[PDB]
Design a protein around this ligand. Structure first.
Ligand SMILES: [K+]
Ligand SMILES: [K+]
Ligand SMILES: [K+]
Ligand SMILES: [K+]
Ligand SMILES: [K+]
Ligand SMILES: [K+]
Ligand SMILES: [K+]
Ligand SMILES: [K+]
Ligand SMILES: [K+]
Ligand SMILES: [K+]
Ligand SMILES: [K+]
Ligand SMILES: [K+]
Ligand SMILES: [K+]
Ligand SMILES: [K+]
Ligand SMILES: [K+]
Ligand SMILES: [K+]
Ligand SMILES: [K+]
Ligand SMILES: [K+]
Ligand SMILES: [K+]
Ligand SMILES: [K+]
Ligand SMILES: [K+]
Ligand SMILES: [K+]
Ligand SMILES: [K+]
Ligand SMILES: [K+]
Ligand SMILES: [K+]
Ligand SMILES: [K+]
Ligand SMILES: [K+]
Ligand SMILES: [K+]
Ligand SMILES: [K+]
Ligand SMILES: [K+]
Ligand SMILES: [K+]
Ligand SMILES: [K+]
Ligand SMILES: [K+]
Ligand SMILES: [K+]
Ligand SMILES: [K+]
Ligand SMILES: [K+]
Ligand SMILES: [Mg+2]
Ligand SMILES: [Mg+2]
Ligand SMILES: [Mg+2]
Ligand SMILES: [Mg+2]
Ligand SMILES: [Mg+2]
Ligand SMILES: [Mg+2]
Ligand SMILES: [Mg+2]
Ligand SMILES: [Mg+2]
Ligand SMILES: [Mg+2]
Ligand SMILES: [Mg+2]
Ligand SMILES: [Mg+2]
Ligand SMILES: [Mg+2]
Ligand SMILES: [Mg+2]
Ligand SMILES: [Mg+2]
Ligand SMILES: [Mg+2]
Ligand SMILES: [Mg+2]
Ligand SMILES: [Mg+2]
Ligand SMILES: [Mg+2]
Ligand SMILES: [Mg+2]
Ligand SMILES: [Mg+2]
Ligand SMILES: [Mg+2]
Lengths: 53, 85, 148, 204, 49
RNA sequence: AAGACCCUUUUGAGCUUGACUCCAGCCCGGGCCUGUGGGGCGGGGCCGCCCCGCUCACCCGGUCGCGCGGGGACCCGCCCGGGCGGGGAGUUCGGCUGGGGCGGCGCG
RNA sequence: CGCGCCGCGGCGAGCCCGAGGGCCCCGCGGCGGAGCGAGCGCGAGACGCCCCGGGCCCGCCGCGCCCCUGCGGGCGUGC
RNA sequence: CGGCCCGAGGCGGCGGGGGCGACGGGCGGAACUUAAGCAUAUCAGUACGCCCCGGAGGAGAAACCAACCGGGAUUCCCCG
């Protein structure tokens, strides 16, 4: 989720912020962009159970 | 150490000693085949060395050809019988 | 639980305890254990003597069940006898009906000598003895024995 | 006894005058033919029976010629880029033996048959010749015969492509057991994946 | 014959001593007593633990 | 227009060579491929070399196989060994310092 | 997920919902219990509310002396 | 003139070829990255490229492990 598109930074010199952008210039691939991945996605390897003697 | 130390080892049970474990037909086949083939070229070289009493040279040459000392000793012994005259 | 953690008490503080002058960067010392002989030498000599180098013979394959060797002291021997029987044995310090304790059945090989025994004859069968385990046992009237 | 005990004894004397002459006439002839060729009958009938051949309808034999020597990498202008441990071009050795390569070449040419086994027949300075046994699995003599109709079942398609023949088994290391072989028994990939797995249990 | 009435047979194993035989012959002898060959009871778990 | 000059970063890339470590390719030697004969030199008490016939392997040409040749057990190929090798590959090119460099060395 | 330290619960020379089998029942290792020595290997009681220090005992390195089963045992001395 | 051997063209019945974002088998095979630099090492016997099956596949009835008062084909789980 969030990483099926193609996006790369434009770099400095074009008067825009440095995040990855889709072809056309749309923000992508950051947690602060509409449509990007989570900063730290949830995973099922969380320890769900607990032990008791 | 490859054993565990204890005196009286084996003192509780009685062990079973298994039997330790020719074929004149095979010797007969080799004698017919030997008759219509002869020996290999390396084997003929060894016989010539053995006739001249260069025993250590014969062993060196057989180790170089065969690559294993027990087989090289078994071959030079095998070839002396035809190399005595 | 996330709701009792120290990190949630830093909302509104610009920098979550990592400082303004220094800051929080990726790997300012390198990754892992690197640097132990150069720029972490003050750490490695203070807390880890004998981390660098070689020492002693090597064995290309150790046999774990050959080198295994359990041991028991003489002060633990009488606890192998069940409690229902200990009183009677102490009562009659017999030379002709002394208790026999075979320690391999309980899973020990050698008998060492820390401690002391009660004043009561007893027979101990094992695979090896230390010199003062034997000495304290013969002091009591006991005998050592070797077993298969 | 029978006759094949003498033939086996004879083939253990390849340096003799007799077999030196016959080995010479065969390499001259095989040099005059194509790389893959159908044979009427096995050139070595006793070795063919040792490996499972039977003179029935549905067994066939082809002779395969392969080239001798080492391996050269397919790198344009002889340039490997990258790290210096990976720079070599000539002087390498193939992972599979020449016997296994012979079976794979004839399986690709004849994909409607089943490869069984193979054996050596000749060599010279540039080539080795092997013979390959193949079974047609839709012939009724093959299908109705309990001795061979294991190969009529479909998990036996293109065996030489999957490393299941005897020469293909040797390159995977499977002629060994015990110490020195504990990391290859299902597969080299399978033992790696089993040994590197993180198993996160519920009551960890 | 023994495979037929439920005994596993391993011809690759060899006995190392005389006690190994007596302990297992007594185990074979006992099982042949408690076996019937044709409202019948099916035995659960390992037989003679 | 997050200086392109200048400096710093244990960030690069193009180019060069007497940087460091190497690779193709080429040259050289023995071996196997590999027949069947004749000779000379030397050594040690059988071994090493070298030379020259034949044709049958192997190789090349002419021909619409229309009335034919040339080479030859040497060359090629393969295995191992030695030399040449910025044509090409990867990487490095200290620090202090009244900015850096030249110089100097309170760098032990 | 691994390592260190601190707090609280249960049991304590013991402790333990492995895997598996019949929120309940049964369930091996393991870790702790003895250390030291490259290794052959040898192997701890003597004191003390607690803490700190002293003294002594075990192993590794050295060395008087006596002896049986002997380059093995015993009894000592020293960093 | 027939036989056997080694080949050629045709005819009949039957079989093969292609397809899949997983699992499985066989080959070829990186570099970023880490080492606070960088060549051995690591990343990784991974990405990716080619070939081949099945409902599973592969493996398998010792030219095995051991050193015991011994076990006994293959696969999978717990344990170090
Ligand atoms: K993407
Ligand atoms: K920005
Ligand atoms: K910015
Ligand atoms: K637990
Ligand atoms: K902090
Ligand atoms: K700071
Ligand atoms: K860093
Ligand atoms: K780092
Ligand atoms: K280090
Ligand atoms: K050393
Ligand atoms: K070929
Ligand atoms: K490169
Ligand atoms: K590169
Ligand atoms: K490297
Ligand atoms: K093998
Ligand atoms: K192994
Ligand atoms: K700038
Ligand atoms: K600049
Ligand atoms: K500047
Ligand atoms: K600049
Ligand atoms: K940088
Ligand atoms: K740089
Ligand atoms: K550039
Ligand atoms: K450039
Ligand atoms: K250049
Ligand atoms: K060069
Ligand atoms: K450079
Ligand atoms: K020592
Ligand atoms: K690779
Ligand atoms: K890399
Ligand atoms: K790499
Ligand atoms: K690099
Ligand atoms: K690197
Ligand atoms: K290394
Ligand atoms: K490397
Ligand atoms: K490497
Ligand atoms: Mg951008
Ligand atoms: Mg989203
Ligand atoms: Mg503040
Ligand atoms: Mg703010
Ligand atoms: Mg900092
Ligand atoms: Mg600062
Ligand atoms: Mg900051
Ligand atoms: Mg700027
Ligand atoms: Mg800029
Ligand atoms: Mg730096
Ligand atoms: Mg650069
Ligand atoms: Mg450059
Ligand atoms: Mg360059
Ligand atoms: Mg500077
Ligand atoms: Mg047809
Ligand atoms: Mg990465
Ligand atoms: Mg680095
Ligand atoms: Mg770095
Ligand atoms: Mg770098
Ligand atoms: Mg590895
Ligand atoms: Mg299968």
């Amino acid at each position: 989720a969030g990483v099926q598109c193609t996006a790369h930074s434009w770099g400095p010199g074009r008067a825009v912020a440095r995040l990855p952008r889709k072809h056309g210039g749309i923000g992508a691939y950051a947690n602060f962009a509409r449509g990007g991945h989570m900063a730290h996605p949830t995973t099922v390897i969380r320890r769900w159970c607990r032990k008791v003697n | 150490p490859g054993k565990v130390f204890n005196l009286k080892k084996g003192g509780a049970v009685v062990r079973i000693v298994r039997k330790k474990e020719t074929k004149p037909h095979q010797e007969f086949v080799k004698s017919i085949i030997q008759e219509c083939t002869g020996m290999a070229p390396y084997e003929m070289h060894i016989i010539e060395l053995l006739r001249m009493n260069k025993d250590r040279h014969a062993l060196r040459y057989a180790k170089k050809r065969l690559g294993n000392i027990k087989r090289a000793k078994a071959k030079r012994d095998q070839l002396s019988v035809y190399a005595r005259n | 639980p996330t709701r009792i953690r120290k990190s949630r008490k830093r909302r509104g503080h610009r920098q979550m305890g990592y400082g303004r002058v220094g800051g929080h960067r990726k790997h300012p010392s390198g990754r892992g254990k690197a640097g132990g002989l150069q720029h972490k030498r003050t750490s490695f000599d203070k807390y880890h003597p004998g981390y660098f180098g070689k020492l002693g013979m090597r064995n290309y394959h150790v046999r774990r069940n050959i080198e295994y060797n359990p041991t028991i002291n003489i002060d633990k021997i009488w606890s192998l006898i069940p409690e229902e029987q200990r009183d009677g044995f102490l009562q009659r310090k017999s030379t002709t009906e002394a208790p026999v304790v075979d320690v391999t059945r309980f899973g020990f090989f050698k008998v060492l000598g820390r401690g002391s025994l009660p004043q009561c004859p007893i027979i101990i069968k094992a695979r090896y003895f230390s010199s003062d385990a034997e000495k304290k046992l013969r002091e009591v009237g006991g005998v050592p024995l070797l077993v298969p | 006894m029978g006759a094949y005990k003498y033939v086996q004894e004879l083939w253990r004397k390849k340096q003799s005058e007799a077999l030196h002459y016959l080995f010479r006439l065969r390499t001259w002839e095989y040099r005059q033919l194509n790389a893959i060729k159908r044979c009427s009958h096995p050139t070595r009938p006793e070795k063919a029976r040792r490996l499972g051949y039977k003179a029935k309808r549905g067994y066939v034999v082809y002779r395969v010629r392969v080239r001798r020597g080492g391996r050269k990498r397919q790198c344009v202008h002889g340039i490997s880029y990258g790290k210096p441990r990976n720079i070599g071009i000539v002087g390498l050795k193939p992972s599979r033996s020449l016997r296994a390569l012979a079976e794979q070449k004839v399986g690709r040419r004849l994909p409607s048959l089943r490869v069984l086994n193979s054996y050596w027949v000749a060599q010279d300075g540039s080539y080795k010749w092997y013979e390959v046994i193949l079974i047609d699995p839709f012939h009724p003599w093959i299908r109705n015969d309990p001795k061979i109709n294991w190969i009529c079942n479909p998990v036996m398609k293109r065996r030489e492509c999957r490393g299941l023949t005897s020469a293909g088994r040797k390159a995977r290391g499977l002629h060994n057991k015990g110490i020195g072989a504990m990391k290859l028994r299902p597969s080299k990939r399978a033992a790696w994946k089993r040994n590197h797995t993180r198993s996160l249990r519920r009551y960890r | 014959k023994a495979r037929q009435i439920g005994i596993a047979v391993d011809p690759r194993r060899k006995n190392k001593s005389e006690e190994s035989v007596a302990r297992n012959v007594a185990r074979l002898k006992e099982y042949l007593s408690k076996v019937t060959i044709f409202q019948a009871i099916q035995h659960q778990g390992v037989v003679m633990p």
